[PDB]
């Protein structure tokens, strides 16, 4: 998922909404998210039960991460089982919540 040299996996910039009704990307943005040297898949145990993982990213940069649900329904259910019970993972009050940016995680606007 690069194509340059080496290390290019945190690039891009923000962008302005122009329409969305036949379209509903399902994106689960999850902040707040720890560092103690823990696999992917910790932050995707969050969201096996919840939903099929088309595709997810694990940013430790700015400690962020982006799991893209099979279903919006998946990922609508995680962010709000946040609201009623507090998301704790690998001991952390995480925050869940769903993100706009990116449909898929992919980036890759068609030519319409």
Same mark, same amino acid.
């Given at each position: 998922? *690069? *194509?340059?040299?080496?290390?290019?996996?945190?690039?891009?910039?923000?962008?302005?909404?122009?329409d969305?009704?036949?379209? !509903?990307?399902?994106?689960?943005?999850? *902040?707040?998210?720890?560092?103690?040297?823990?696999?992917?898949?910790?932050? !995707?145990?969050?969201?096996?039960?919840?939903?099929?993982?088309?595709?997810?990213?694990?940013?430790?940069?700015? *400690?962020?991460?982006?799991?893209?649900?099979?279903?919006?329904?998946?990922?609508?259910?995680?962010?709000?089982?946040?609201?009623?019970?507090?998301?704790?993972?690998?001991?952390?009050?995480?925050?869940?919540?769903? %993100?706009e940016?990116?449909?898929?995680?992919? %980036?890759?606007?068609?030519?319409?």
């Open positions: 998922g *690069s *194509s340059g040299s080496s290390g290019k996996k945190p690039e891009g910039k923000p962008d302005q909404k122009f969305q009704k036949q379209e !509903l990307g399902r994106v689960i943005h999850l *902040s707040n998210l720890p560092h103690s040297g823990y696999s992917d898949s910790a932050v !995707l145990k969050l969201a096996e039960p919840y939903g099929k993982i088309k595709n997810y990213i694990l940013m430790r940069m700015k *400690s962020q991460a982006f799991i893209e649900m099979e279903t919006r329904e998946d990922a609508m259910a995680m962010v709000d089982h946040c609201l009623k019970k507090a998301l704790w993972f690998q001991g952390r009050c995480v925050k869940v919540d769903l %993100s940016k990116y449909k898929k995680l992919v %980036s890759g606007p068609s030519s319409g």
